From a paper:
In yeast, the evolutionarily conserved GID E3 ligase mediates glucose-induced degradation of fructose-1,6-bisphosphatase (Fbp1), malate dehydrogenase (Mdh2), and other gluconeogenic enzymes. “GID” is a collection of E3 ligase complexes; a core scaffold, RING-type catalytic core, and a supramolecular assembly module together with interchangeable substrate receptors select targets for ubiquitylation. Here, we structurally and biochemically characterize Gid12 as a modulator of the GID E3 ligase complex.
Thus, we built coordinates for Gid12-SRS, and generated atomic models of Gid12-GIDSR4 and Gid12-Chelator-GIDSR4 by docking them with Gid12-SRS and the respective prior structures of GIDSR4 and Chelator-GIDSR4. In agreement with the biochemical data, Gid12 primarily contacts Gid4, and also Gid5. Three insertions (Ins4, Ins4-5 and Ins5-6) form helical structures that pack either against the sides of the propeller or between blades, while an insertion in the third blade of Gid12 (Ins3) forms a meandering loop that plugs the central pore on the bottom face of the propeller. Gid12’s interactions with Gid4 and Gid5 bury more than 2400 Å2 of surface area. Gid12 interacts across a diagonal around all eight strands in the Gid4 β-barrel, from the N-terminal tip of strand 4 at one edge of the cylinder, nearly the entire length of strands 1 and 8 at the center of the interaction, to the N-terminal tip of strand 5 at the other edge of the cylinder.
Numbering used by the authors:
A (entry chain 8): 27 to 54, 84 to 164, 192 to 212, 219 to 258, 275 to 357, 383 to 403, 412 to 454
B (entry chain 5): 4 to 163, 186 to 219, 234 to 275, 280 to 457, 466 to 553
C (entry chain 4): 269 to 303, 310 to 362
D (entry chain 1): 16 to 52, 80 to 97, 109 to 126, 326 to 360, 393 to 422, 425 to 440, 496 to 522, 527 to 614, ...
């Protein structure tokens, strides 16, 4: 077995790498954007000392007041504390600082179920590892704190049922990586929540600090939008569908006032009921992750796609 | 006696869970509500913020939970509108208390939109002073900006002379201040068929490139301010400037849905208000593909309905020039009308229905009746289907049975009463019946059925005896009935012409 | 064929011309539609000043050039009164 | 600087500059950069050289911002362009074309057929699009004897007699029906902008009418070469837009943005690599496995390898204090212990070497190189030759690094 389409040796691969490196340098064998990517990785992962030292070396931090202003802007210490408490198992304290520092709007408007479930698993593991009253309290907490959230969705009820079935005993749910995954999702949500304040304080207050999440050239949106094509457009043809039912609709069922918003999203629900899945992941959800992880994802994907298509390339050593 | 730490602990313990605040409402521990509603002017700012935060957290209830609680929730909402006097001291308070107060007012107007708000004028004056003194002079903080955004959101929810002029001036100043930063991204390379001038821009179907507002607060402020400016400015410029028209035409291709929708609302307003504006069909041809694309977006704002705007344009061109409709001809060539009719036939054949499906079907029936109001082609194309008239008779029969059932139980019920749930459905069906009856061939061949005539007469008699007998139900119950009487009499006066068989 | 259409493109308003050309087609039966020898159509010329109608009847599987030659029907009262109707 | 950017946006189409083909256009501009070297001066210089003038004048829109705030408040032959830019003149003199070859095209009954200047390479670009506009009609108003589309490059008399042959993928205006068909669309008449485009991700040919996307006509058309093609009966004429002079009607940029976002969603949503283990006897050998790279976020191997590379880069650049801070932060966060020990050994070795007197950039450069190598060798999508090819939608330097 050998590669059929092409088999690069070292010299011609180095020639191609040098050619495209020259192209990237003219666009920008060194990359001028790597320190900025490192600073973005340090800040976005909530590392205290390395981010301050990198910002000092790159020429932004000059005083202790500037250190305080930077840590206030990007909220590195608070986010690191929340991530540490989520990973350790002090979940209630984690929502306590989330509601205290960041406001209550973060929790009132998908990670609340995850935090409650992780608290339930931690409490069950603490009860099992180290009897009627405690079990009754755990059952009451499970049936009261997350009843509506589990009854709202089918996958929510399935996850709650799986956790309850695993509770009555003496691997992913018992794994410690789930806490780190929930902490990373919480950190990404927190950064996405506080991005507009950073934008306003950079722009209006004329701060010398940069915007590490989004450059001024690219576009970004606060909201998430799904574009559903083949719904109302001209890409269907010049044919007309006919009615295929003869059953009636009713059988298958000085003071200032304000508008009534009851049943104003009828069209979205109906169209949900009535090369695909176009949305705006690039401009709403892509820029709120560490960029170096995206680059390694691209590198692994490209390596596997080249290995699949019978093309042999030397790897990085 | 409740302190700051106690209120902080109560606020921390009530996040997420909805049963605990229901317990707080139901229990006789509700004396805190009095402390929650006695906002003294001498109270501390931290205490005021904690009280407003607890008031916001307690009223954030699911509709099932607010159905469990009952009239006490609405009593607390009404007492919030009547007891607290933070609106009179709007200019005296700091920005955080004002922001939390307007947020609470937004929640209260969202849950209980019927009772009156007696302090709108103070809020309007505070908004005018806040945008004239702090925002326009680049002397605004974060909290003041979010307070302005919340005030714009609250002012958009009002149903509805010098204060109107002041509001129009302030909104125009906001639009001019925000839009002047991104005015340099307008770029269009065109050809005039007869160099740095702007002559002949309104002769091509092309529009300038996508204009993106990077700042999110600026985009929100521009969208809300331009919507209220559209509400205001005809009573009292920016419409006639070519540069602003090109700016909005470039804003049509943006990424934010709110920006695209407010641009569509801005560009299509002169067609319904200005005189001799409907002759400008090139602008209509430039605009319409983006409206068709605006049908296809999943999160849509509450102030934008593409069905209403498309129906309004078609009805306008049917009323002005009955023999020539530009919208129908430019939608027929581009395969859109066949998609609309197919979606109508799919909506009429759903196996399971709810209120949302009824509203969607009602909008489809209205737009299909607007298709055939002045064209025989779409009239015969709609009457080619043999199952439409059966569904029309089914809807009329359903309304007759509902009205008769309400009449038969007038003694037990006997005052605000909700209207019958399918008044819009029947009104749209009668609009189709009238549009179909406007042609002689359909009156002599297809609409020959006696069932339609007897159903129309039954609807007329039942509605008249409703207005004669059950007048205790209020005006909200009777206005759709009188509208139904008018539309049924229009259909009847179409069927009673001499050369019709009925 | 192209010449007559090219010359037709510069004509004036057709309602201001004395003669009106049109086509007639029978749709169905008048007393009862349900209870077909009208598959052709009429080429009709109408003169407005004297108000009379001439024409031909065309069908592929029929005889050709059948004439019409209509005239207005005189009434028994020179004084005339007007009724009206309007589709709503 | 900004002058080069202004010139390259004023010379080339905007949607072509957001694809991975933009590297070739940048190289072409920089080779002949001596000809050219606040945008009003640049536009005036480009008009003096000539990009904004013909004979119909090539106008340009320039806003007035200060007044608004006051009242209220052939060069393409020289460069080396390799994409279609004009119609080709037939040697038999059966057509009337303008000097620029795009503004007018009128035949001088049999169809007069012609194709474009150049062909479209399969392995170089993602989306191509061009528009025509009917200027005159020789029947009904909404009925024109024009066939417009693409033609396979390896019958001409058959094209002149009938309008099309078996190798033409196009749209016919006399019946509103595609060539080798079906209810697809409707006939177009006078003053109608009809656009034709090809998508090399999924490999489909689509048509647009007055800014409305009419759907995909032909599918599964990858690994092929196409040329624009038009056939006209005498009496009617078209005006062609390839994007170089004026702005399009469609909004093809939104189409490209949607496909790029879909591709980005599909892709992005021990701890030492060592030497290459597949070098035996000096040649590469294929392992009998499914993948060669088995790193993932969910297993923690990818962050560990990334942290090792970051530490090695920081030490290699002479930033030992920053590496010490990163190691301290990694200790504070806590196979991570092995990463901690390896990093600590690296700072100890660097301190020993400094007392006695990379891999990240390789990852970036190799990522760009393998993206381009995937692009130019026509790789399959996932398994079959009909799946979409998402690597065509990635501009690595303009969408990831900046």
């Amino acid at each position: 077995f050998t590669y059929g389409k092409k088999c690069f040796t070292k010299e011609e691969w180095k020639e191609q790498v040098a050619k495209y490196s020259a192209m990237g340098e003219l666009y920008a064998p060194i990359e001028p954007t790597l320190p900025r990517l490192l600073l973005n990785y340090f800040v976005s992962m909530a590392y205290e000392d390395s981010s301050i030292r990198m910002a000092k070396e790159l020429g932004f931090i000059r005083n202790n007041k500037d250190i305080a202003v930077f840590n206030d802007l990007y909220k590195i210490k608070e986010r690191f504390h929340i991530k540490h408490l989520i990973k350790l198992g002090r979940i209630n304290e984690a929502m306590e600082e989330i509601n205290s520092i960041f406001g209550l709007e973060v929790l009132e408007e998908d990670l609340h179920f995850k935090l409650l479930l992780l608290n339930l698993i931690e409490m069950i593991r603490s009860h099992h590892q180290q009897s009627n009253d405690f079990i009754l309290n755990l059952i009451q907490y499970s049936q009261n704190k997350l009843a509506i959230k589990a009854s709202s969705s089918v996958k929510k009820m399935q996850e709650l049922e799986l956790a309850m079935t695993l509770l009555l005993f003496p691997q992913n749910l018992y794994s410690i990586s789930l806490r780190s995954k929930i902490a990373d999702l919480v950190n990404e949500k927190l950064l996405k929540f506080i991005h507009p304040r950073i934008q306003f304080e950079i722009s209006n207050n004329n701060s010398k600090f940069p915007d590490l999440l989004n450059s001024d050239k690219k576009i970004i949106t606060q909201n998430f939008t799904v574009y559903n094509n083949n719904l109302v457009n001209g890409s269907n043809g010049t044919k007309i569908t006919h009615i295929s039912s003869d059953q009636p609709i009713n059988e298958k069922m000085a003071a200032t006032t304000f508008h009534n918003l009851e049943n104003k999203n009828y069209w979205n629900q109906t169209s949900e009921l009535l090369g695909l899945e176009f949305n705006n992941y690039y401009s709403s959800e892509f820029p709120y992750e560490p960029r170096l992880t995206q680059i390694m994802k691209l590198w692994c994907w490209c390596e596997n796609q080249l290995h699949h298509n019978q093309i042999g390339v030397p790897r990085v050593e | 006696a409740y302190s700051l730490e106690n209120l902080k602990k109560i606020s921390n313990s009530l996040v997420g869970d909805q049963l605990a605040k229901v317990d707080y409402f139901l229990a006789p521990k509700c004396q805190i509500f009095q402390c929650l509603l006695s906002i003294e002017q001498s109270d501390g700012v931290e205490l005021k913020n904690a009280k407003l935060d607890l008031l916001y957290t307690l009223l954030h209830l699911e509709p099932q939970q607010r159905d469990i609680v009952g009239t006490y929730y609405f009593d607390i909402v009404s007492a919030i509108y009547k007891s607290m006097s933070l609106a009179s001291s709007f200019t005296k308070n700091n920005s955080s208390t004002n922001y939390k107060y307007i947020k609470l007012l937004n929640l209260c107007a969202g849950v209980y939109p019927n009772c009156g708000f007696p302090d709108l004028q103070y809020l309007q004056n505070g908004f005018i002073q806040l945008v004239n003194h702090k925002f326009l002079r680049s002397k605004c903080k974060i909290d003041e900006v979010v307070t302005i955004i919340e005030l714009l959101k609250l002012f958009l929810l009002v149903d509805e002379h010098y204060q109107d002029f002041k509001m129009a001036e302030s909104l125009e100043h906001i639009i001019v201040k925000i839009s002047s930063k991104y005015l340099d991204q307008i770029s269009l390379k065109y050809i005039v068929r007869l160099p740095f001038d702007n002559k002949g821009v309104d002769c091509t179907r092309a529009i300038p490139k996508k204009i993106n507002i990077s700042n999110m607060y600026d985009s929100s402020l521009l969208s809300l301010a331009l919507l209220l400016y559209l509400r205001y400015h005809y009573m009292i410029k920016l419409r006639n400037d070519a540069t602003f028209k090109m700016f909005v035409l470039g804003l049509l291709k943006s990424n934010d849905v709110n920006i695209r929708c407010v641009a569509l609302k801005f560009l299509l307003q002169p067609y319904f208000t200005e005189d001799k504006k409907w002759e400008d069909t090139r602008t209509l041809e430039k605009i319409l593909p983006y409206l068709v694309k605006s049908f296809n977006y999943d999160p849509l704002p509450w102030w934008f309905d593409p069905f209403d705007m498309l129906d309004s344009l078609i009805v306008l061109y049917n009323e002005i020039t009955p023999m020539n409709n530009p919208v129908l001809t430019t939608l027929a060539h581009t395969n859109v009308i066949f998609c609309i009719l197919s979606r109508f036939a799919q909506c009429l054949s759903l196996p399971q229905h709810n209120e949302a499906t009824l509203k969607t079907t009602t909008k489809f029936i209205k737009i299909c009746a607007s298709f055939a109001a002045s064209d025989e082609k779409y009239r015969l194309l709609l009457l080619n289907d043999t199952l439409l008239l059966n569904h029309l008779e089914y809807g009329l029969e359903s309304h007759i049975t509902l009205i008769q059932d309400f009449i038969s139980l007038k003694d037990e019920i006997k005052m605000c009463l909700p209207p019958i749930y399918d008044h819009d459905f029947v009104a749209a069906w009668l609009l189709l019946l009238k549009s179909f009856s406007r042609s002689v061939s359909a009156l002599r061949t297809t609409l020959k059925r006696n069932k339609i005539a007897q159903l129309l007469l039954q609807i007329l008699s039942k509605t008249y005896t409703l207005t004669k007998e059950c007048y205790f139900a209020g005006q909200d119950f009777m206005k759709p009935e009188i509208m139904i009487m008018g539309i049924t009499l229009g259909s009847i006066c179409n069927f009673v012409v001499e050369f019709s068989n009925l | 064929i192209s010449r007559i259409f090219s010359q037709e493109k510069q004509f004036d308003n057709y309602l201001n011309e004395r003669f009106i050309f049109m086509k007639w087609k029978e749709k169905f039966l008048v007393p009862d539609a349900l209870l077909a020898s009208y598959d052709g159509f009429y080429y009709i010329v109408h003169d407005q000043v004297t108000g009379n109608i001439q024409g031909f009847y065309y069908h592929q599987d029929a005889e050709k050039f059948q004439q019409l030659e209509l005239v207005p029907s005189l009434k028994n009262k020179v004084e005339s009164s007007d009724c009206s109707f309007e589709f709503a | 600087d900004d002058v080069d950017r202004e010139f390259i946006n004023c010379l080339f189409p905007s949607y072509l500059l957001q694809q991975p083909v933009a590297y070739d256009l940048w190289i072409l501009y920089l080779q002949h950069r001596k000809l050219f070297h606040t945008r009003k001066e640049i536009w005036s210089k480009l008009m003096n050289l000539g990009v904004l003038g013909t004979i119909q004048v090539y106008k340009y829109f320039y806003p007035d911002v200060n007044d608004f705030t006051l009242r209220f408040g052939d060069i393409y032959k020289i460069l080396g362009y390799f994409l279609p830019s004009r119609w080709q003149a037939q040697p038999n003199n059966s057509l009337q074309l303008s000097q620029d070859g795009i503004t007018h095209l009128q035949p001088n009954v049999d169809f007069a057929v012609t194709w474009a200047n150049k062909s479209l390479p399969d392995n170089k670009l993602t989306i191509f699009y061009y528009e025509i506009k009917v200027l005159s009609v020789t029947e009904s108003a909404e009925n024109s004897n024009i066939v417009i589309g693409y033609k396979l490059v390896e019958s001409i008399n058959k094209c002149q007699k009938y309008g099309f042959d078996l190798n033409v993928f196009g749209y016919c205006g006399f019946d509103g029906l595609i060539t080798n068909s079906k209810e697809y669309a409707k006939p177009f008449g006078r003053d109608d902008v009809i656009g034709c485009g090809i998508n090399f991700i999924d490999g489909s040919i689509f048509f647009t009418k007055n800014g409305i996307h009419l759907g995909n006509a032909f599918t599964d058309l990858n690994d092929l070469e196409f040329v624009p093609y038009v056939a006209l009966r005498p009496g009617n004429s078209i005006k062609t837009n390839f994007g170089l002079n004026e702005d399009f009607v469609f909004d093809i940029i939104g189409y490209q943005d949607k496909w790029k976002s879909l591709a980005y969603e599909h892709i992005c949503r021990k701890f030492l690599l060592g030497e290459d283990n597949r070098f035996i006897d000096g040649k590469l050998v294929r392992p009998d496995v499914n993948n060669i790279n088995n790193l993932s976020v969910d297993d923690g191997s990818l962050p560990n390898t990334l942290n090792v590379m970051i530490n090695d880069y920081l030490i290699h650049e002479g930033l030992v204090d920053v590496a010490k801070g990163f190691l301290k932060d990694l200790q504070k966060d806590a196979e991570s212990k092995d990463v901690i020990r390896h990093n600590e050994r690296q700072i100890m070795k660097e301190e020993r070497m400094v007392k006695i007197r990379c891999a990240l950039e390789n990852v970036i450069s190799n990522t760009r190189a393998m993206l381009s190598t995937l692009l130019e060798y026509n790789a399959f999508g996932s398994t079959n030759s009909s799946d979409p090819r998402y690597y065509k939608a990635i501009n690595f330097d303009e969408d990831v690094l900046n």
